[PDB]
């Protein structure tokens, strides 16, 4: 069948923004297969061979100072321009999380069980989840899936709590996120 | 910190090209090479911004030429097939008979060529399903999402069959509800 070698070429123009358009850094990187070969860093002002394979291109492009000028200016004409274009629906995007608490398994009480705090469909990805037992924060026995990207500009995450639930116990999951004025709390009574 | 990435790639001999913009790991839009038009990830995006898709093709042209120059300079050193990690999950906790979406998450792979089909009870599904193009990674591997809207039931099992040159055989990632 089709058994030919494959040859991949990638080009990435990376605009890095710190404190908005206050501090900007342009990274133009060329990757052959799995190997970055040549790179432009606006902090440096010129191309640098990341590997020997990309040295011809670095020398070749650096020899043209007018191209270097345009590249340095790109921080404004390109990076800062695009930031402003999409800022409204990207940097300012905020989607409130849906928070649900439920026992992992159906267990009679007084037996080990995981308390699952489901936090799904939120944006952006910055988030803080906290477990409480009867008003007291519990930092031990917390297993997390970490931040999960859905691919549709939403994130989800599961923060689980190792517990042996007693009748009368109150468990609270507190969620903090840029999309809410105050912490979201959800209770589960054993 | 925020990061906007203009990501392009070209693959030989497949002759596959891609042009997309990325924001903090999410796709803003990509250019459909065949139709020569901008496709926004979220359609709302197209109401606040525009892109001359035609320019993306000029770039891909240069990329293709550069690839062949590079291919030769490397004495025809081919890419190593790195098989993907595959994960199936729902975009929300499952409630029997309550609308949901299965997410086939394909990750950490290269080259950006893959074959994905959903199987319900051993049979392909096409109705309602959608996918994303290949998302770029900092290690220069790729990321990809496949979706399948569905009503959870105790009577159905699902599989996300993934084909990639890095695999010795098709990879099935099972998902089913358990009472």
């Amino acid at each position: 069948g089709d058994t030919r070698p494959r040859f991949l070429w990638q080009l990435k123009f990376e605009c890095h923004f710190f404190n908005g358009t206050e501090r900007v850094r342009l990274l133009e990187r060329c990757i052959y297969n799995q190997e970055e070969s040549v790179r432009f860093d606006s902090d440096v002002g010129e191309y640098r061979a990341v590997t020997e394979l990309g040295r011809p291109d670095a020398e070749y492009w650096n020899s043209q100072k007018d191209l270097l000028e345009q590249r340095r200016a790109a921080v404004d004409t390109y990076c800062r321009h695009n930031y402003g274009v999409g800022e409204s629906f990207t940097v300012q995007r905020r989607v409130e999380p849906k928070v649900t608490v439920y026992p992992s398994k159906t267990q009679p009480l007084q037996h080990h069980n995981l308390l699952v705090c489901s936090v799904s469909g939120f944006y952006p990805g910055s988030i803080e989840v906290r477990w409480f037992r009867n008003g007291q924060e519990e930092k031990a026995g917390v297993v997390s899936t970490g931040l999960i990207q859905n691919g549709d500009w939403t994130f989800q995450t599961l923060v689980m709590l190792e517990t042996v639930p007693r009748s009368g116990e109150v468990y609270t999951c507190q969620v903090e996120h840029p999309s809410v004025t105050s912490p979201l709390t959800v209770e589960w009574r054993a | 910190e925020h990061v906007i990435i203009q990501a392009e790639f070209y693959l030989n001999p497949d002759q596959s090209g891609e042009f997309m913009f990325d924001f903090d790991g999410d796709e803003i839009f990509h250019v459909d090479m065949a139709k020569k038009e901008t496709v926004w990830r979220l359609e709302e995006f197209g109401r606040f911004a525009s892109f001359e898709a035609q320019g993306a093709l000029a770039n891909i042209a240069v990329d293709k030429a550069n690839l062949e120059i590079m291919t030769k300079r490397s004495n025809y050193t081919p890419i190593t097939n790195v098989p993907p990690e595959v994960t199936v999950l729902t975009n929300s906790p499952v409630e029997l008979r309550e609308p949901n979406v299965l997410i086939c998450f394909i990750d950490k792979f290269t080259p950006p060529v893959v074959n994905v089909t959903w199987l319900r009870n051993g049979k392909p599904v096409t109705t309602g399903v959608s996918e994303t193009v290949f998302l770029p990674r900092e290690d220069h591997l790729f990321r990809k999402f496949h979706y399948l809207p569905f009503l959870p039931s105790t009577e159905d099992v699902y599989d996300c069959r993934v084909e990639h040159w890095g695999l010795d055989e098709p990879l099935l990632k099972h998902w089913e509800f358990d009472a």
């Binding site: 011809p56 492009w61 390109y78 | 911004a49 990329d63 030429a65 120059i69």
Partner: peptide
Amino acid sequence: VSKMRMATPLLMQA
């Protein structure tokens, strides 16, 4: 405002 600008790839030699 208000269209996305793209950076252009430089061409190699030979």
